[PDB]
């Protein structure tokens, strides 16, 4: 339709490069394990991440605006949405929690997923109940709003009535540098420019807006599903019952071949055929196949004291 050419003519692009030296020191960095042996601790990992970002920002020569340029470490709860951070159209670096497992032990703090929110319970610190804003999905371009004063809001009121909006663009990268804590990632951002967008027109580049993830599977109520990519170009799937500890990692191919079976006995026979003998694995696979729903109870928990 002519709307495409209309929008294309309506470019209104104002790219800005405020001497934002690329943080190549942060980019293309070899993953490292913080802990000497055993496993690390949330404090240790946080300290290592802070040291890394601090030395990077010192090398680049720029400044930062630390929140308890823009830098944030394990502040998913403190930040209601990433849009508030992105609206400034400044470089942003995050040390977030984007797990590749539905549940289990995160670093040294166990975690589980109830509904679409993460029931995170740090070993040392307040328990966190926040969602995840779809950071590591495919795509490098994101759409976000821009800070505007209430006076500018009134000025645009007549202009936004039609459906015009001021939208900023950014470029994305993360690293996942810690092997002992794969559930955590080091997000990296770079703003590009700002334009005006019509609400009722599509975009070529399929730019997406960060959204809350929907872990729950509509086909398997009471269960949470997730899948990720592996070093060896393998597509693994992590599944587990919502708000509960158990989880399992399996290749999506085997899960696919299993899902269409008719008899649980056939499922068990096929599992035996592949050499999988661990009951903790086959039993969970069968449970997911049959979609068994169980009302997991809420019980008090006794954690450790932090050993600084």
């Amino acid at each position: 339709t002519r709307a495409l050419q209309r929008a294309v003519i309506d470019k209104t692009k104002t790219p800005i490069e405020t001497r934002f030296y690329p943080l190549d020191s942060l980019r293309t960095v070899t993953p490292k394990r913080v802990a000497d042996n055993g496993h690390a601790v949330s404090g240790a990992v946080r300290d290592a991440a802070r040291r890394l970002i601090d030395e990077s920002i010192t090398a680049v020569g720029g400044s930062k605006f630390e929140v308890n340029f823009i830098v944030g470490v394990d502040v998913d709860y403190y930040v209601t949405e990433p849009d508030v951070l992105l609206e400034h159209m400044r470089p942003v670096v995050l040390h977030t929690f984007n797990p590749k497992k539905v549940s289990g032990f995160d670093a040294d703090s166990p975690f589980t997923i109830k509904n679409n929110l993460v029931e995170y319970k740090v070993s040392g610190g307040a328990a966190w109940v926040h969602p995840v804003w779809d950071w590591c999905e495919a795509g490098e371009f994101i759409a976000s709003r821009v800070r505007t004063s209430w006076k500018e809001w009134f000025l645009q009121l007549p202009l936004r009535m039609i459906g015009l909006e001021k939208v900023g663009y950014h470029k994305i990268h993360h690293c996942r540098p810690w092997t002992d804590c794969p559930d955590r990632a080091l997000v990296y951002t770079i703003p590009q420019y700002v334009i005006w967008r019509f609400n009722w027109i599509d975009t070529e580049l399929h730019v997406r807006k960060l959204k809350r993830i929907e872990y729950q599977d509509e086909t398997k109520p009471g269960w949470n599903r997730l899948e990720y990519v592996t070093d060896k170009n393998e597509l693994l799937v992590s599944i587990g019952r919502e708000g509960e500890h158990a989880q399992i990692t399996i290749e999506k191919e085997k899960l696919d071949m299993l899902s269409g079976l008719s008899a649980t006995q056939s499922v068990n026979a096929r599992l035996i055929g592949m050499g999988h003998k661990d009951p903790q694995y086959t039993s969970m696979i069968v449970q997911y196949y049959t979609g068994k729903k169980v009302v997991s109870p809420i019980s008090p928990t006794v954690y450790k004291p932090t050993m600084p």
Binding site: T30, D47, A48, R51, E55, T58, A59, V60
Partner: protein, 333 residues
């Protein structure tokens, strides 16, 4: 041999404190013009234009003269060495690094030198200096910065309860691959080098064999400042000339002996060799103006003469009767 041995978490605060103490009161700086850099003292020029100014401004300041000896005349070097040995009462230690430019790690390079340069220079020049440092990663000031960082680390490990400024105020003379330090951290220096990932060689000061510093031997630093070329490094190799084949042997030998006279006129076991070279290759050499107009020309206290003789004998572990026999053999040839 590139290395990527990042330091420990604790050492980072020490390195930052050392960098801040290096910064001192010189917050802002400006780059030098191309003409000024050219008349100061391609590929060398682009980095020199900034590094020479940075050295002259920060490393040659009032509060950074305690450690940055590199950058002064040899008479000034001798005066500084004698003052330092008098202060330490002949209790000093020597550091000898092996391929420091080939062993400094990426973390050290990006957290000492880059940080110092960025803090010293103006913000508007950040991009150029950072690009030059990135090109360097993938000359003289780097070695001095590494030596200062290692000295600061050793001082921090020795006295962790003192203030960083007071700790750094005790930094002794340092010049590239060579430097001086207190002997009380002789054993702890190895652990500091291991933490950073560097290899360190240390030797206790011995008056019998003299003191080694900048390939210079102090015969008796307690009283006299008389100094000579290092005998251990040069005697075993002075008989062989490493000049390019295109130069005649006579011209290279003449230049070598002229330099030796300019630096080691009254040193035993070297003056005789220099005089015999001047006697043999001298007349057979070409015109000295010809070698002064030739590129390869630059490619090379009487009161304590007894003490210097004995110190050289101790350095070379040669008996006095053997020394006299060698001197007689050299002169009569």
């Amino acid at each position: 041999v590139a290395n990527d041995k990042k330091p420990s978490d604790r050492i980072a605060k020490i390195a930052e404190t050392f960098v801040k103490l290096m910064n001192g009161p010189f917050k802002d700086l400006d780059p030098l013009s191309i003409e000024e850099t050219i008349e100061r003292l391609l590929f060398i020029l682009k980095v020199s234009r900034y590094t020479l100014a940075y050295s002259d401004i920060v490393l040659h300041a009032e509060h950074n003269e305690h450690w940055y000896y590199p950058g002064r005349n040899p008479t000034e070097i001798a005066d500084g060495v004698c003052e330092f040995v008098s202060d330490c009462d002949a209790e000093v230690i020597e550091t000898d690094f092996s391929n420091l430019d080939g062993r400094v790690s990426s973390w050290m390079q990006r957290n000492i030198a880059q940080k110092a340069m960025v803090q010293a220079f103006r913000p508007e020049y950040r991009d150029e200096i950072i690009s030059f440092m990135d090109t360097i990663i993938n000359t003289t000031p780097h070695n001095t910065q590494y030596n200062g960082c290692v000295e600061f680390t050793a001082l921090t490990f020795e006295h962790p309860d003192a203030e960083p400024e007071d700790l750094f105020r005790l930094i002794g003379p340092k010049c590239g691959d060579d430097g001086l330090s207190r002997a009380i951290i002789q054993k702890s220096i190895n652990r500091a080098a291991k933490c950073f990932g560097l290899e360190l060689k240390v030797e206790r000061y011995n008056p019998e064999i003299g003191l080694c510093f900048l390939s210079r031997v102090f015969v008796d630093p307690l009283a006299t400042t008389t100094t000579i070329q290092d005998p251990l490094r040069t005697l075993r190799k002075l008989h062989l000339t490493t000049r390019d084949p295109t130069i005649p042997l006579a011209d290279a030998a003449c230049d070598r002996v002229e330099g030796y006279l300019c630096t080691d006129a009254l040193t035993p076991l070297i003056s005789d060799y220099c005089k015999m070279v001047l006697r043999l290759y001298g007349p057979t050499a070409s015109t000295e103006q010809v070698r002064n107009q030739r590129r390869s020309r630059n490619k090379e206290h009487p009161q304590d003469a007894h003490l210097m003789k004995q110190v050289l004998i101790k350095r070379t572990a040669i008996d006095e009767d053997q020394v006299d026999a060698l001197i007689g053999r050299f002169a009569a040839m």
